[PDB]
Amino acid sequence: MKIMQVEKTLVSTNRIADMGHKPLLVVWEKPGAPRQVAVDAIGCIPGDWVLCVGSSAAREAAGSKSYPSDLTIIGIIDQW
């Protein structure tokens, strides 16, 4: 897994219908790294340090085992 930091939120009005109702967040390693997008299964604010998992693991961690995802937030780090 990875230690990421949240920047902000992202909206796409036309997503496929299987993406459900879940939110999306922009995350990097450190400010200035390439930015990625994760589905948020916890509820996080900008400036948080979070744990991200990406694989079929991420598919099942966000929703069910056929969910269209490859990066999911699964926890908030207590101290970083």
Binding site: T9, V11, G20, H21, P23
Partner: protein, 89 residues
């Protein structure tokens, strides 16, 4: 901008959960929490159309299973100028 999202629940715990989910899911501003009477609580957010849509969907999915539960979730993409007299600021 101008667009209104509303969630109504049975009790205050799912209402606070829904408000937090909305404001973490999109770029919207919370304008009001209301006790209606009889155990009904209502939360109102304002923003752009896409942001309000995304926020209300996330909030409903979040509060679906907390406490007594969700009563209603609704998006209004543009509101008449009359209704601005009863909406809180």
């Amino acid at each position: 901008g101008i667009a209104l999202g509303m969630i109504e629940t049975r009790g205050l715990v799912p209402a606070i959960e829904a408000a937090d989910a909305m404001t973490k899911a999109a770029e919207v501003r919370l304008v009001g929490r209301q006790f209606v009477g009889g155990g009904y609580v209502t939360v109102l957010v304002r923003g752009e159309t896409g942001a309000v849509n995304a926020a209300v969907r996330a909030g409903a999915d979040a509060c679906e299973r907390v406490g007594d539960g969700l009563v209603a979730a609704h998006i209004i993409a543009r509101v008449h100028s009359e209704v601005e007299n009863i909406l809180p600021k």
